[PDB]
Write an enzyme that holds these catalytic residues in place. Structure first.
Site, mmCIF file in Angstrom:
data_model
loop_
_atom_site.group_PDB
_atom_site.id
_atom_site.type_symbol
_atom_site.label_atom_id
_atom_site.label_comp_id
_atom_site.label_asym_id
_atom_site.label_seq_id
_atom_site.Cartn_x
_atom_site.Cartn_y
_atom_site.Cartn_z
ATOM 1 N N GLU B 71 11.938 -51.494 -11.598
ATOM 2 C CA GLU B 71 12.651 -52.241 -11.834
ATOM 3 C C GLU B 71 12.461 -53.572 -10.450
ATOM 4 O O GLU B 71 12.292 -53.517 -9.551
ATOM 5 C CB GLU B 71 14.574 -51.739 -11.562
ATOM 6 C CG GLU B 71 14.790 -50.632 -10.525
ATOM 7 C CD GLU B 71 15.720 -50.542 -10.356
ATOM 8 O OE1 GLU B 71 16.332 -51.970 -9.580
ATOM 9 O OE2 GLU B 71 16.354 -49.816 -10.529
ATOM 10 N N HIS B 100 23.983 -54.695 -13.669
ATOM 11 C CA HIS B 100 24.035 -53.370 -13.477
ATOM 12 C C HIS B 100 23.333 -51.846 -14.253
ATOM 13 O O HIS B 100 23.914 -50.438 -13.775
ATOM 14 C CB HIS B 100 25.076 -52.591 -12.482
ATOM 15 C CG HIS B 100 24.996 -52.133 -11.035
ATOM 16 N ND1 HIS B 100 25.570 -50.746 -10.660
ATOM 17 C CD2 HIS B 100 23.951 -52.254 -10.494
ATOM 18 C CE1 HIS B 100 24.572 -50.514 -9.801
ATOM 19 N NE2 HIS B 100 23.598 -51.097 -9.192
#
EC number: 3.1.27.-
Lengths: 89, 108
Positions: B71, B100
């Site tokens: 990520e 998120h």
């Protein structure tokens, strides 16, 4: 030496568990309330050393299997360097 | 500086690595980054957090034998981090999350 407390007998769902963690750990307002967001918080926000006291874990497990998955993330962070001490009381 | 979903996705597909403006949390922390201080830009000017392994713990991203994920932060300039992240696999699938890690969308 920071301390986070989870009163297991007050956890009524997995969502509630995440809300409590957000409060106890003073997580960012946008906290995702999921396992990936928790890992992100343990590796990119929480400061160590940390003592996590999870009281009445058995109750959280019942109101909820989701509790064990959350505990597992803390244990994984610990195995991967985070100075975390977990107290199941 | 390349830090947009499409900009970073294109760069990842082309070079198979993140742009030079990315650093891992391990590196950032070693440089003095303290999340609660919101000082990443102070200790690492022009940098964004990125490159760490993403475990797809909720199983929302498509899994495959051998496939792993990483990520990186998106749209970051300075101050505290936001909720935007790009997710890229070992076989180059690319996804985006703006909440998120709650939901994901394939962008490549």
């Amino acid at each position: 030496m920071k301390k986070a407390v989870i009163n297991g007998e007050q956890i009524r769902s997995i969502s509630d568990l995440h809300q409590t963690l957000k409060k106890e750990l003073a997580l960012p307002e946008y906290y995702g309330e999921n396992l990936d967001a928790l890992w992100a918080a343990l590796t990119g926000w929480v400061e160590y050393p940390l003592v996590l006291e999870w009281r009445q874990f058995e109750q959280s497990k019942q109101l909820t299997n989701g509790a064990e998955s959350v505990l597992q993330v803390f244990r994984e962070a610990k195995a991967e360097g985070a100075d975390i001490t977990i107290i199941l009381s | 500086v390349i830090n947009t979903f499409d900009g970073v996705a294109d760069y990842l597909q082309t070079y198979h690595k993140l742009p030079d403006n990315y650093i891992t949390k391990s590196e950032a922390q070693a440089l003095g980054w303290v999340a609660s201080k919101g000082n990443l830009a102070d200790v690492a000017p022009g940098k964004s957090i990125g490159g760490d392994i993403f475990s797809n713990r909720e199983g929302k991203l498509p899994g495959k034998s051998g496939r792993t994920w990483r990520e990186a932060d998106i749209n970051y300039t300075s101050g505290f981090r936001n909720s935007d992240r790009i997710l890229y696999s070992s076989d180059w699938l690319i996804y985006a999350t703006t909440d998120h890690y709650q939901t994901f969308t394939k962008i490549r």
